[PDB]
Design a protein around this nucleic acid. Sequence first.
RNA 1: UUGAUUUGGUGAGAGG
DNA 2: CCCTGTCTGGCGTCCTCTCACCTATGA
DNA 3: TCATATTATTACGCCAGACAGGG
Lengths: 613, 1322
Amino acid sequence: MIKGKQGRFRQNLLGKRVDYSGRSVITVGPYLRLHQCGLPKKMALELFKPFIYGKLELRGLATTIKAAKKMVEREEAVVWDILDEVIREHPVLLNRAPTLHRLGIQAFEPVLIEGKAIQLHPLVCAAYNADFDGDQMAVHVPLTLEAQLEARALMMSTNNILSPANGEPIIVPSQDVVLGLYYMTRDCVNAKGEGMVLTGPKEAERLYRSGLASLHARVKVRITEYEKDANGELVAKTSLKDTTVGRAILWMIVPKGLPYSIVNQALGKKAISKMLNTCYRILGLKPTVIFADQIMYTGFAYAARSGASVGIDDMVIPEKKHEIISEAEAEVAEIQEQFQSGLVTAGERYNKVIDIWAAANDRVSKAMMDNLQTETVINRDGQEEKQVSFNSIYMMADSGARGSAAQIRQLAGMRGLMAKPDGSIIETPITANFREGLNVLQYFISTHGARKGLADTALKTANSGYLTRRLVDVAQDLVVTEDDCGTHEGIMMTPVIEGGDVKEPLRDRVLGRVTAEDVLKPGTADILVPRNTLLHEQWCDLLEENSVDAVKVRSVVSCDTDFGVCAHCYGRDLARGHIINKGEAIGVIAAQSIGEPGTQLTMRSSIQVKNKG
Amino acid sequence: VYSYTEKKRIRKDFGKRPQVLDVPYLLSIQLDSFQKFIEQDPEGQYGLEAAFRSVFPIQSYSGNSELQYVSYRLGEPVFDVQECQIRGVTYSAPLRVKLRLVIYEREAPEGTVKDIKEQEVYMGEIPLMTDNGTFVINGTERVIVSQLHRSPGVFFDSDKGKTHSSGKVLYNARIIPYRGSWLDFEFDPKDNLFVRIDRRRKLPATIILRALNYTTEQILDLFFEKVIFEIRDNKLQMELVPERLRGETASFDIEANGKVYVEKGRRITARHIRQLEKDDVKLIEVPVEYIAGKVVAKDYIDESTGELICAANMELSLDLLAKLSQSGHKRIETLFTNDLDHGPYISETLRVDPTNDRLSALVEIYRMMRPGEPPTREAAESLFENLFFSEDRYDLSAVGRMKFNRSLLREEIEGSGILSKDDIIDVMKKLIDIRNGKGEVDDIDHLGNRRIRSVGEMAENQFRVGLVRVERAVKERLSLGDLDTLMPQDMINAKPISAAVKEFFGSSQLSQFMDQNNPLSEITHKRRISALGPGGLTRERAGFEVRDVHPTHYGRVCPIETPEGPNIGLINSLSVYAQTNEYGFLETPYRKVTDGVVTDEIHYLSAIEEGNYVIAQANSNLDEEGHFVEDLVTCRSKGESSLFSRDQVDYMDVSTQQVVSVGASLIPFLEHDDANRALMGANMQRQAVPTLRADKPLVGTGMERAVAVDSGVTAVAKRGGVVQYVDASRIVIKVNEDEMYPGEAGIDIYNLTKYTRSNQNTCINQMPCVSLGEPVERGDVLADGPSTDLGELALGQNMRVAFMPWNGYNFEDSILVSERVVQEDRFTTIHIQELACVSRDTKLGPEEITADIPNVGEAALSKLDESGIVYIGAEVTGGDILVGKVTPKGSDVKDSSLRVPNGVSGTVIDVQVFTRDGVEKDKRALEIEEMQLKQAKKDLSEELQILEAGLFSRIRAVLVAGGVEAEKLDKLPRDRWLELGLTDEEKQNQLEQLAEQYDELKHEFEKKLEAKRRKITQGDDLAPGVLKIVKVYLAVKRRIQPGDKMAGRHGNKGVISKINPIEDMPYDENGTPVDIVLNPLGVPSRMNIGQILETHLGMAAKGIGDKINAMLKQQQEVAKLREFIQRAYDLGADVRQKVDLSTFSDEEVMRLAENLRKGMPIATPVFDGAKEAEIKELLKLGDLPTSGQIRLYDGRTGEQFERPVTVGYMYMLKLNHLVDDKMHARSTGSYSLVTQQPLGGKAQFGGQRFGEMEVWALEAYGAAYTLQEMLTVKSDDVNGRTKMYKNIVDGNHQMEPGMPESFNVLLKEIRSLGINIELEDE
RNA sequence: UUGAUUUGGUGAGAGG
DNA sequence: CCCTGTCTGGCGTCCTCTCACCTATGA
DNA sequence: TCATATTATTACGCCAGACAGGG
Ligand SMILES: [Mg+2]
Ligand SMILES: [Zn+2]
């Protein structure tokens, strides 16, 4: 009754079953602002029975408690106004069932739903690892007043816009919205309204809506970008940018301080992520929340206007694919004719066959990748001119919405050399993609390769979860409990180099960590930075300009604090811009941030210089 | 030619390869196994006769009486299957066994017995199988799932790397019997051979040789060859066959015949062996340093002194040679211990052995097996002679002896079930050979090494357990038997056999509850091959390789239909064409290929036969003769897919469906999907609910017909003919004369099972699909079951789907649905709930069934009778009352009255009551008694009259050869008819013959109706104990709503997000809205591109349907329709279908075109499907654009979507994960007993488990107060939660926390040890 | 003072 | 007496939903 | 009904931790 997974510790004292809680299937609802979620009326009237009882007893409609329970058992016409007056400013904790890190419990404000499904704002889904293929989430109600304030001030969904494992934003726009942006801010060499001049972004959207120009048609506009070059003062500079119609329409949504060159490019997924990141580093939190919502709304709207389907003709077969396969078949014929006459060894034969099928696979991938990335060739006022294609699967790949090089490779080019479960590769590849039909043997080899992957994930998840458990129980105690340990020791952060090109730069390792002694400028004996400064982005840029060798920085393992970690030897807060506060549990967020990517990890001569120096 | 429901709607069948072997009956594993179990099969194998011929005749220990066997039988079941499911009894049969007791006198092995007695005794009841492969165990309908276990017979396993931490391989060898003790041999890293029995302690293995009465010299004769040292002129020369020097270093001077052959230093090559064989070199003189390391073979004794020189297996030194040379033993036999090949493993094991003779070997084996209790001669000898060598407790079966002789390369395959000396010695020899290098190991995933148990084998093993318990009981009663005052039921007892066989059929890991929501799901739960179960591996332990697909699965096990999660690849599903071998292995069909011409004869192979041959591929182009049109063809030799010549192959695959199963060969365009999404597609396709209106997949594979027939959910006609079609109650089929028996005039009356409960609360319902007066053939379907449409298989429905992002409402995998889907009720499924109410006599008198419900006012007496129990059918919801069932003394009276659960609605469709003999309220119980009483007689006479009408006419019909006088035959009406004498003329006995029929009809009807009333007149039929037994069947009708789950056949899951109006849908320029919008972004990542080809080909199918709907609505004479139908059925490449359409009588064209105006159904088979050019060509026959993509406008803005989008028809299914079975919320209610925390679940009104990682997530924030109320006030602390509820309803959000109760439970459980845990200072 | 039993435990299957 | 096979214990993912089944004996 | 009290299967995979054996 004590030990085990089902004893008292792990089953009734660390985890408890909980009143004022609910559970249902999630769905999208994209009209939401990212601090609010949809919550059904039936669940809302069940979770908030005591607040409704208290409200009903305050008005004077009833007398005893029984009367109120009969009123909400009957659900009369007056308790729905009571319910909209108990919801209004009262957050709830939404929770997806495998919570791995702290962004899997977030607090929203309810918006009542005719329905029986929790409507969950889409950007927030990338935090929960929540798709909508049958998922379920639990709602919990903060009862007391300190818990409502903790849900609004610590656990609100507007407050979690950076992942605590690093500095990367976690409210990155996921899949439909990056397709809507990548189709919006792009260009083509001729459209309606090529090379006309526009007096502002407002009439750019007016020309798109009336039907006189196209969403991607290159155009000189006059935009007014606000650069804040003074000390907190926004200076207007207006100019004519040679841009498109879609870039001006998306400029109507960008806040004041960002420059126009954040939208002047094509805006895949990495570019929109660094757009939101530069907005958070410059303009702070509130413009970044409202701008994340306006990004999501305009992405959904112009992805709807795009009509970006997928067809059977979109997967363009290379015309050179069959001759490449016949040249590889002639090469394996030459190698086996040498094998009949015994000139070569068996291992060298197997190595030569795997090498020519790897080379033919790379050539087929380059043939289809040229045939997709520049297939469109349209003329403008004369001879032809080429451009990047508006093929649907190519925009779904190039935008980074869903797809890569490998998946679009397997839908058009040959799908490689699949490997048998012995671990060694199979010498006869799967020369047929998915647009052509796989025959029987090729699909069976494919099933070898995919059954191994499903078995690996379904057995990998146990070790990933047990690793997170061991990590949060070794951490478990360590709380930021001082402000300075008063030391001069700390580890020597250098960039890491394995022997190829320099892998992880110093700005990734010494971003937001407080230096141990003052870094000498690389010239001679200068106090470039002082000895207890947090290295945020401005300091790291003045480190990259001076090409600083390596920084002696303060590390947690050198902290002199008895029973805890001081506030300087930890570093930056990582989801807050400042230093770690006195109190915030860093052992648990660290253990979750190491063990949470446990699913994505796998389970089962001489020196040649490259550069010149 | 076609049958008559085949000419209704003949599906356009793509497919180029002519099929040679039609699909076998898909439930043949279950049916053939259980038909093997119960069948009167003389020669004894296999069945119940094997059990009775093993256990009988029982003779006691010289008790001079020997009960023997004659014959067995199974009587009728007392309950047919329907009333058996209704009542709750097992569907069983009584097992009537004839037993013949003969009793001897003194001294009669040969003497005649003094007395006999014989009777048809009754032992157990065995559960029979329903005709569809199911059991009915206790009211519920269960399925035994066929196991996949290791075969009996020897296995040579390696375990090459992990032990010893030194890279040294071991080699063990397991002799797995079908029944009995396990014997394993195994090396250890000191290169010594060890035996262990039943995974016990480790004995050095040659002791088992010393247990088989082998001396040391005989063992060394077996496992070693002799090298002969002859004492000669000098230095004791050597016989040397040159094979023994292979690969070793020449230590000495190799010379003979006055010639130096090989000098010292160089290794001996095979050319030197050829020199020694050409030069005929045997005898060479050795140095004394050569014999100074070798080991003697046999014993030698000094002759004159009379003592021992050396024991066998002793290494030799020079002074030992001085001992044995001077005595007079001229021959010296040494053991050739080659370090390369012939290792000295047995000899070093003999050096490890602490034993010397046979008796100490048996004493050491007995001290291993049974410790503590002493080892005496009789006890140890009986132990070891009944370990392996008696027919009782050790039995390799026929499978085991076949594998045992096959793995040892024996010639024969049939032998005795026990082992012998030579078998154990051969296993040790093959293990030593594998260590030496020759021969190799076996793998365990190889399906030639992996047998299937099925229903008959498992029930036979449990029945044999019951029979050995009843023979120990018969041996008990007989030695205490007094004669002649007992007859054979004081000896025998029906209890242990029935107990064991109901233990297996009720509570086993394989007799499990049938997934019954779908015809597919029934027919693919019956074809399931589980690795789990008794004697097999477990879910949470193993492994990686047994979860993985091995190259012997090609055509035996489906590669892609295995459930994802904790058991992947343990719950494999059987392929389409794969039968089961005689021994239980998996044999699959192949086409025998003698020479260039591929012959149409089939021939079945298993994996231990598939390796030797060379087997072709299913789709390799052969034209008009069977000759492979290429000179090279892809085949597979020994699990290796490789390219071979035109004329080397011996077999070809039969058909191209044969790799996959019946779940994942219903997916069209399987070959274009990814493997992962085909797995998710098949596993979700098992989960579909039956819709209210079944709708014919436009893009099918043609295997829908075989699944919908072979799963017994449709009423397939037994005998062909016409129809009478009363049908409100039953289809009545008049039988054509050729299929009709001479006696038993006979017309077939099919029972339609109307609205009733499935095992997954779905609705199984049959509807007649034939009209009145319409010809049907044998094997044709008559009534469409759940999820069937004219004999095809209609799980979901086909809807117009656009691929586009639509305003974010289909973001990750969500699905946006029009209102035209929910207005038409085209997913509005029907669920049925059984609810029981009993009024058991717990304590303080019995409970009561009265409407006079207390405290509660005229809100109890409402949906009931004037004085008790829900009336019949209204629209009951949640909080209603169905069965008033409350006691007095339980003011102090209470409300246990079974009500309707919270959140559900419905209509009471049926009320069953076999209650405590007394339920009658006023006088209803006997009121209905008279109703049924008069009902029976009516139909009884009616049926007789029905036949009488047919017979009367038949009398006159035959009245021609013996009185055709039409005006002299219409005498008496209901009195007599025939008043003449035919006598002979040309034999019309026929009048007299029919006279007996009517005479017997009335005579039997009376008796038939006599028992009817007898059966009618009764309290009711059920078991005892339970008193008030009221079951009420609600039927909720759930429509579709934001939150349900839909999915196609390709793995495209979706939670339907927004239920749009019709106006806001994307309409094309023709005006029709699209029904369902999916999302294109799923398609490049999830590489299931087959849903797009299904979309385009379904678009083309409905294009033909719209074209026929125009040609038939704007009505044309049938020449233009038959021309367009002929063009639609020719269409393209060389196919199998074409049609013979000009023989459809100018009406069967029109009925076909009436059944095609919703869309022309297209069969795209599994791997030989429709190519893309045929999709484009079919889209050109309909007037649709060739790209598959139409420009679509927006319903909101009226303006065109740029870049035209894909619209087509995908067959989308509604899975039974409905959102108002998942929605749940809890504020406050009941909790558990032991702990003070809330209960768990939905059926218990309970709250969410705020688990461990959520606590770590709140610790990760600064949520200290949220966590404090999350584990103290909201959950556990009783004073805290009552103060909090009062604080909330006063308007004061403040918690008074206290200490959790489960921590004080922890303190008392820790303190209830010898542990003093406390709580210190303030 | 105005009412009541699953959690307990096993086995099997399913979802994310 | 310091290496050493060998044996014994102790881990092995969270959340949820549906169903059935529960000691023998006995004057 | 009211006290009487425990036997004829094996088929995980590391990975520490303690123990008798022997150069
Ligand atoms: Mg999912
Ligand atoms: Zn410190």
